[PDB]
């Protein structure tokens, strides 16, 4: 894995690379506005420790940070989404804690509400593979990464609210 984290937009100003998780990017530059990814899938971060708004990259050149969907040119800490062979699964449910309806998802879904009739999801739970919730339908609004594991309830993927639109792989 490799991203290309530089300071302006269309690739202009220093350029800071990264091979790896890194909890504070502040000390290397004080704002980015244009990424290339040049190998892996990324999650970068507003805040420093993974913290803040959370952008999910692949492979690929990012002219803004518009282009990842930012909201502004403050990039503090990055993550390599670790690889993974197999398949991906994880289980939906429309109450928290684990609780009402369950639904099984093992591919990628572009409308939560077209699949599963649903408009939030207050429960989920991950168990092969890494994937990425957005708050709207087609990929699109916030975005926030799931590792395997519980998700109890809509805090734990770090959402204002159980308002969710699609769900992808990471790949």
Known sequence: GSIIFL???????????????????????????????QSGCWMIYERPNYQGHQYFLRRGEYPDYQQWMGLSDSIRSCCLIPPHSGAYRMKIYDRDELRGQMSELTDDCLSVQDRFHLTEI??????????????????????????????????????????????????
């Open 122 to 171: 207050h429960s989920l739970n991950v168990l092969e593979g890494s994937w990425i919730l957005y708050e709207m339908p087609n990929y699109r609004g916030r975005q926030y990464l799931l590792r395997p594991g519980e998700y109890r309830r809509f805090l734990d993927w770090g959402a204002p609210n159980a308002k969710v639109g699609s769900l992808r792989r990471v790949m």
């Open 7 to 37: 300071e302006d937009r269309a690739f202009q100003g220093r350029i800071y690379g990264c091979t790896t998780d890194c909890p504070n990017l502040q000390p290397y530059f004080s704002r980015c506005n244009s990424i290339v990814v």
